[PDB]
Amino acid sequence: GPKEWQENKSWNAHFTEHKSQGVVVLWNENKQQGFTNNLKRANQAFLPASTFKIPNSLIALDLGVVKDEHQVFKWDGQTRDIATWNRDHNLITAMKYSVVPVYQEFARQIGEARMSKMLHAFDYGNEDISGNVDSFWLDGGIRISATEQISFLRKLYHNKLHVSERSQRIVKQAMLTEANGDYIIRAKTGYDTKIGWWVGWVELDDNVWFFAMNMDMPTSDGLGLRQAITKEVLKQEKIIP
Amino acid sequence: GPKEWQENKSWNAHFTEHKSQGVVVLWNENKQQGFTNNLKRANQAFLPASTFKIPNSLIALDLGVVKDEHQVFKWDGQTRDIATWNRDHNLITAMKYSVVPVYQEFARQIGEARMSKMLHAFDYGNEDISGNVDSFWLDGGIRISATEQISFLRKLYHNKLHVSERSQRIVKQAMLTEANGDYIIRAKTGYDTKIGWWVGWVELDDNVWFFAMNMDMPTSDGLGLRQAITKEVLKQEKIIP
Ligand SMILES: *C(=O)N1C[C@H](NOS(=O)(=O)O)CC[C@H]1C(=O)NOCCN
Ligand SMILES: *C(=O)N1C[C@H](NOS(=O)(=O)O)CC[C@H]1C(=O)NOCCN
Numbered sequence: 463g464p465k466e467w468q469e470n471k472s473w474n475a476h477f478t479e480h481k482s483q484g485v486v487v488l489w490n491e492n493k494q495q496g497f498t499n500n501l502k503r504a505n506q507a508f509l510p511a512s513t514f515k516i517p518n519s520l521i522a523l524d525l526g527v528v529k530d531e532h533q534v535f536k537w538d539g540q541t542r543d544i545a546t547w548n549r550d551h552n553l554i555t556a557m558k559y560s561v562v563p564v565y566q567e568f569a570r571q572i573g574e575a576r577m578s579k580m581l582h583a584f585d586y587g588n589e590d591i592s593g594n595v596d597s598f599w600l601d602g603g604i605r606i607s608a609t610e611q612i613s614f615l616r617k618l619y620h621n622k623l624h625v626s627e628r629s630q631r632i633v634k635q636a637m638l639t640e641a642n643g644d645y646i647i648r649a650k651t652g653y654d655t656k657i658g659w660w661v662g663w664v665e666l667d668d669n670v671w672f673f674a675m676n677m678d679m680p681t682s683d684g685l686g687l688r689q690a691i692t693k694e695v696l697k698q699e700k701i702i703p
Numbered sequence: 704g705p706k707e708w709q710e711n712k713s714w715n716a717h718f719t720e721h722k723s724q725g726v727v728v729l730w731n732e733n734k735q736q737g738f739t740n741n742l743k744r745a746n747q748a749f750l751p752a753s754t755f756k757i758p759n760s761l762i763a764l765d766l767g768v769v770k771d772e773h774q775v776f777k778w779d780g781q782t783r784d785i786a787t788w789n790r791d792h793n794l795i796t797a798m799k800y801s802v803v804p805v806y807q808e809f810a811r812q813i814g815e816a817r818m819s820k821m822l823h824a825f826d827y828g829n830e831d832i833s834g835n836v837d838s839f840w841l842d843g844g845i846r847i848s849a850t851e852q853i854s855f856l857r858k859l860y861h862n863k864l865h866v867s868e869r870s871q872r873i874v875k876q877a878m879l880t881e882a883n884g885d886y887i888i889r890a891k892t893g894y895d896t897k898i899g900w901w902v903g904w905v906e907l908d909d910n911v912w913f914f915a916m917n918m919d920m921p922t923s924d925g926l927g928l929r930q931a932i933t934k935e936v937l938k939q940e941k942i943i944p
């Protein structure tokens with residue numbers, strides 16, 4: 463019988479091109495088949511870093527910590543290194559600019575008990591929030607693999623997570639990254655100072671391709687490689703032109 | 704003091720460069736102020752043509768004629784002149800490719816009594832569904848002006864139409880046309896063999912600009928001018944780069 467998961471090591475060329483190493487995992491929804499350049503790493507667990515703003519957003523919305531995507535979270539007045547963080551934000555722009563202090567406030571409002579209960583209900587990674595309530599996704603005990611990111615994202619796409627359909631629709635709106643006549647990308651980046659992530663999906667007219675990639679990332683100088691390498695794989699597989 | 708609507712006739716150069724005649728109407732949501740090259744034409748009511756797939760979609764969803772944006776509507780097997788129509792579609796692709804026969808089926812299932820009641824509730828144009836329930840927006844009595852399109856779109860943007868929030872969120876998803884790091888466009892085209900339309904809005908980080916344009920369109924050869932002329936205006940006003 464056909465294989466649910468297939469390894470394609472030719473994608474390693476896209477990583478070694480940049481003296482890098484990592485994994486891309488693709489899932490073809492229509493075919494119910496997955497593809498990766500590294501089966502082992504596809505299933506190894508890493509800190510989610512800023513990809514955690516997907517579940518964090520869902521929980522904050524479902525609990526009413528965030529009322530809607532227009533509610534303004536005012537800048538606290540502390541000038542931070544990332545200039546786009548030094549202003550007021552809403553859910554859309556806080557996702558787009560990956561505004562850590564806004565999401566730390568969400569996590570504090572959610573609190574440990576409800577955060578843990580929600581991650582258990584989401585079957586999210588190892589479901590472990592050990593560490594600080596407002597930083598465990600960057601320096602605490604939670605871990606998730608690329609294949610587990612895909613599992614979670616497929617549930618979100620199909621409105622199957624254990625939060626309201628409304629919360630799921632709002633977060634999918636906030637994940638919008640790129641759209642044109644050929645495809646729509648909904649995704650989220652992350653970086654934990656050692657590993658970079660890009661997770662999300664590509665919507666086509668008659669199919670959707672889920673993706674989760676992580677790569678060794680010793681400095682922020684190479685962060686654009688997260689999208690660049692993933693797009694080289696998508697182009698090789700004829701998913702985008 | 705300042706006026707709700709200001710006339711900026713310099714935009715006429717974008718129509719005359721293409722030997723065209725028409726109107727662009729913009730509404731700055733933050734400032735609660737509008738701008739147009741021709742206030743009279745901005746208030747002239749025309750057949751909506753395919754821009755009617757916005758309210759049609761909302762009504763079909765709210766009544767359960769369309770269950771969700773993934774439900775497949777099978778091709779009826781009749782080969783029509785637009786090749787993209789001769790295939791199965793869902794709500795997303797039916798809007799993207801402006802698939803009239805799919806929307807005619809929605810309209811028949813809605814039926815005239817519910818269609819009329821819902822257009823009255825929407826305050827949509829002249830609310831007149833005279834003609835066939837499955838063609839009145841193409842050859843019947845309904846008429847809507849560019850400023851009336853903006854009024855309708857503003858209600859949709861704010862979830863203020865008299866249908867569920869879910870229906871409004873799904874339709875706004877289906878209107879997605881373009882997105883990048885600078886802007887998001889949600890919009891719908893139309894053409895009635897005499898005039899072409901483009902209506903929708905541009906989402907920025909900290910503002911929304913609604914737009915409605917129509918132009919004289921003797922042949923289908925110049926249909927790309929609907930978006931090109933609008934974008935020239937958006938560029939002149941520094942809304943998009
Ligand atoms: C999350 O992964 N973040 C926040 C921000 N996101 O940028 S993105 O990775 O491009 O989405 C910057 C990187 C990362 C951090 O939190 N970096 O700070 C690490 C030390 N506090
Ligand atoms: C509506 O305006 N339509 C449907 C389709 N839309 O193309 S768009 O202008 O690019 O949105 C083709 C043009 C127009 C029609 O005239 N078609 O409706 C009659 C077909 N039964």
Ligand SMILES: [Cl-]
Pocket residue numbers: 634635638875876879
């Ligand atoms: Cl969207």
